[PDB]
UniProtKB/TrEMBL annotation, chain A:
Organism listed in the record: Hepatitis E virus
Family of this protein: Belongs to the hepevirus ORF3 protein family.
Subcellular location(s) per record: Host cell membrane; Host cytoplasm, Host cytoskeleton; Host endoplasmic reticulum membrane; Virion
Protein name as it appears in the record: Protein ORF3
Biological role: Small multifunctional phosphoprotein involved in virion morphogenesis, egress and counteracting host innate immunity. Plays critical roles in the final steps of viral release by interacting with host TSG101, a member of the vacuolar protein-sorting pathway and using other cellular host proteins involved in vesicle formation pathway. Also acts as a viroporin and forms ion conductive pores allowing viral particle release. Impairs the generation of type I interferon by down-regulating host TLR3 and TLR7 as well as their downstream signaling pathways.
Quaternary assembly: Forms homooligomers. Interacts with host SRC, HCK, FYN, PIK3R3 and GRB2 (via SH3 domain); binding does not activate the kinases. Interacts with host AMBP/bikunin and AMBP/alpha-1-microglobulin peptides. Interacts with host HPX/hemopexin. Interacts (when phosphorylated) with capsid protein ORF2. Interacts with host TSG101; this interaction plays a role in viral release from the host cell. Interacts with host SIRPA; this interaction down-regulates the phosphorylation of host IRF3.
Top-level taxon of the source organism: Viruses
Amino acid sequence: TSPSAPPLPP
Amino acid sequence: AVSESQLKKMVSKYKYRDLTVRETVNVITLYKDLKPVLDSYVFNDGSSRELMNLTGTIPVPYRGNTYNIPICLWLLDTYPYNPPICFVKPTSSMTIKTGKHVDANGKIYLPYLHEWKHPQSDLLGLIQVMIVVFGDEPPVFSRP
Ligand SMILES: [Cl-]
Ligand SMILES: [Cl-]
Ligand SMILES: [N+]
Ligand SMILES: [N+]
Ligand SMILES: [N+]
Ligand SMILES: [N+]
Ligand SMILES: [N+]
Ligand SMILES: [N+]
Ligand SMILES: [N+]
Ligand SMILES: [N+]
Ligand SMILES: [N+]
Ligand SMILES: [N+]
Ligand SMILES: [N+]
Ligand SMILES: [N+]
Ligand SMILES: [N+]
Ligand SMILES: [N+]
Ligand SMILES: [N+]
Ligand SMILES: [N+]
Ligand SMILES: [N+]
Ligand SMILES: [N+]
Ligand SMILES: [N+]
Ligand SMILES: [N+]
Ligand SMILES: [N+]
Ligand SMILES: [N+]
Ligand SMILES: [N+]
Ligand SMILES: [N+]
Ligand SMILES: [N+]
Ligand SMILES: [N+]
Ligand SMILES: [N+]
Ligand SMILES: [N+]
Ligand SMILES: [N+]
Ligand SMILES: [N+]
Ligand SMILES: [N+]
Ligand SMILES: [N+]
Ligand SMILES: [N+]
Ligand SMILES: [N+]
Ligand SMILES: [N+]
Ligand SMILES: [N+]
Ligand SMILES: [N+]
Ligand SMILES: [N+]
Ligand SMILES: [N+]
Ligand SMILES: [N+]
Ligand SMILES: [N+]
Ligand SMILES: [N+]
Ligand SMILES: [N+]
Ligand SMILES: [N+]
Ligand SMILES: [N+]
Ligand SMILES: [N+]
Ligand SMILES: [N+]
Ligand SMILES: [N+]
Ligand SMILES: [N+]
Ligand SMILES: [N+]
């Protein structure tokens, strides 16, 4: 699909 | 992503075309989000050669989710006798997570690449260890 990555912790 | 015949033409200037085509098909038939691309590769010393790379994403499991992690694998014209040069390619919405396998430029470092030897080592085996290593420690994170 589209590139994706886990969200960085804030 | 491209036909066997077009792949053969892309690697027309390669020293071992049948071997490079076969190992590449063995990956892109399973990993449909990787596509062969002919582009100018710049060596660390600033010289350059037109090389085939695989550009796209590989599926990586992490905490019960599956990410499409963007990579680029460059094949030298001596493939398969020298390892590919491999990068994580963050999008504008991503940042690289550095560690023992990934530097701040996104270059990948693995025992698989250091110990590379045809025919024990191949492109599919490299993708498989990349998926295991990135599932342990994802090499890119998106915006918080
Ligand atoms: Cl982008
Ligand atoms: Cl970055
Ligand atoms: N993402
Ligand atoms: N995490
Ligand atoms: N997170
Ligand atoms: N955080
Ligand atoms: N392969
Ligand atoms: N893929
Ligand atoms: N796939
Ligand atoms: N291409
Ligand atoms: N250079
Ligand atoms: N990519
Ligand atoms: N990509
Ligand atoms: N993917
Ligand atoms: N998965
Ligand atoms: N995980
Ligand atoms: N994982
Ligand atoms: N996740
Ligand atoms: N998943
Ligand atoms: N790259
Ligand atoms: N090369
Ligand atoms: N090698
Ligand atoms: N290499
Ligand atoms: N290579
Ligand atoms: N690499
Ligand atoms: N990138
Ligand atoms: N990319
Ligand atoms: N990218
Ligand atoms: N790493
Ligand atoms: N990491
Ligand atoms: N680098
Ligand atoms: N990169
Ligand atoms: N490496
Ligand atoms: N490396
Ligand atoms: N490894
Ligand atoms: N390792
Ligand atoms: N490895
Ligand atoms: N290897
Ligand atoms: N390995
Ligand atoms: N290996
Ligand atoms: N083996
Ligand atoms: N994994
Ligand atoms: N893993
Ligand atoms: N894992
Ligand atoms: N993990
Ligand atoms: N890692
Ligand atoms: N990493
Ligand atoms: N990693
Ligand atoms: N993001
Ligand atoms: N995100
Ligand atoms: N990020
Ligand atoms: N986050």
